[PDB]
Amino acid sequence: DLHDKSELTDLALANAYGQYNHPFIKENIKSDEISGEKDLIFRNQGDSGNDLRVKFATADLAQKFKNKNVDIYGASFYYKCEKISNISECLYGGTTLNSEKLAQERVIGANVWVDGIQKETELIRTNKKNVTLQELDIKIRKILSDKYKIYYKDSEISKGLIEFDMKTPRDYSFDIYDLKGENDYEIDKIYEDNKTLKSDDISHIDVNLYTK
């Protein structure tokens, strides 16, 4: 049972379009301040020179990356982002070690279908050895957002499923209209686990969208 786009508020649609089209991306930064036992602080590295609060699911996760030259790639937001003093910018997970790269860009294909009809195959990449699922998810939704206008209320697409398949019998999927809420601080909690995948172990991506 896939959720219907009609279930989202105009605010939900806007935030979704916005975060999937303008991901926060920063390479080789290091945080060494834990906050609230499960958050990492990167002072002076958010947009506008604001402070960045990277939120994780568990204190363990936060601890695993303190001191780490990490790469960041995720959905950022300001509304309801716990101030660290000044104003602050937030985001969940999307954190990987910077020292782990690939010799060449790993290219992943995404078979696409609208109402069961196959469309042009899409492509996303990453030179990260271990890329977070959030990043892959974002790169796919940006495409689904611009080619199929999934987040425009007046578009014909009303349902959709994104599925990431590994080279082993393991897959991960997202219901593009199943948002925790209408504000990013709730929507993005789906990434707090910081789920990361070995890039070369990913097989392909399946995208099924529907109308009516």
UniProtKB/Swiss-Prot annotation:
Mutagenesis / variant outcome for changing D165A: About 35-fold reduction in host MHC class II binding
Main localization of the protein described in the UniProt heading: secreted
Cofactor field: Zn(2+)
Disulfide bonds: C81-C90
Domain of life: Bacteria
Annotated compartments: Secreted
CC annotations in GO: extracellular region
Keyword Disulfide bond belongs to the record: yes
InterPro entries in UniProt: Enterotoxin, Staph/Strept_toxin_CS, Staph_tox_OB, SuperAg_toxin_C, Superantigen_bac, Toxin_b-grasp_Staph/Strep, Toxin_bac
Assigned keywords, A-Z: Disulfide bond, Enterotoxin, Metal-binding, Secreted, Signal, Superantigen, Toxin, Virulence, Zinc
SUPFAM superfamilies linked to this entry: Bacterial enterotoxins (SSF50203), Superantigen toxins, C-terminal domain (SSF54334)
UniProt keyword Zinc present: yes
Residues that hold Zn(2+) according to the record: D165, H204, D206
A Pfam family hit: Stap_Strp_toxin
Gene3D superfamilies xref list: 2.40.50.110, 3.10.20.120
The protein's assembly and partners: Interacts with host MHC class II molecules composed of alpha/HLA-DRA and beta/HLA-DRB1 chains. Interacts with host TCR alpha-chain TRAV27.
Family statement drawn from the similarity comment of this UniProt entry: Belongs to the staphylococcal/streptococcal toxin family.
Known role: Staphylococcal enterotoxin that activates the host immune system by binding as unprocessed molecules to major histocompatibility (MHC) complex class II and T-cell receptor (TCR) molecules via their alpha domain, in particular TRAV27. In turn, this ternary complex activates a large number of T-lymphocytes initiating a systemic release of pro-inflammatory cytokines. Also causes the intoxication staphylococcal food poisoning syndrome. The illness characterized by high fever, hypotension, diarrhea, shock, and in some cases death.
Protein name: Enterotoxin type H
Organism: Staphylococcus aureus
